[PDB]
């Protein structure tokens, strides 16, 4: 969870709403196991 | 400075 520790402070002339781009990764100690079929994307139709 | 840390006969 990301919380406003103080605020988002801008002067006049700066936009009142900004954006944060979250980039996600894994460290050197990361390890995956037991390879399996993916289910993040599924197709109900054949490939023409 | 703390010193507390086959059966036989």
């Amino acid at each position: 969870s990301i919380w406003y520790q103080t605020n988002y402070v801008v002067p006049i002339g700066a936009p009142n709403t900004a954006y944060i781009i979250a980039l996600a990764a894994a460290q050197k100690n990361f390890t995956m196991k037991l390879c399996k079929d993916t289910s993040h994307i599924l197709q109900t139709a054949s490939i023409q | 400075r703390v010193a507390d840390m086959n059966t036989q006969v």
Partner: protein
Amino acid sequence: ETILEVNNVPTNATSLMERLRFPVSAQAGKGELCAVFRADPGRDGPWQSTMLGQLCGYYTQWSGSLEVTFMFTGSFMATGKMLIAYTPPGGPLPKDR
């Protein structure tokens, strides 16, 4: 590092680019909540946009720590601080900061 879709609220193709970033703006100074997401790379949610999430989809078990880089894309004159808190399992969604 791969873009994490924390703001996976929009669904239409016109605003699909809004999924890659989440807004930060001036608040009332009451420790407001900006964004939440689960820290599971293989879970169906924000992490599916990540290569860590996609590659985790091909493996049953994962272990190790995760890097989540939050990059601020406001102005140079935009200042502020954010508390990014990772809750270990057991603790629900925090009500306050």
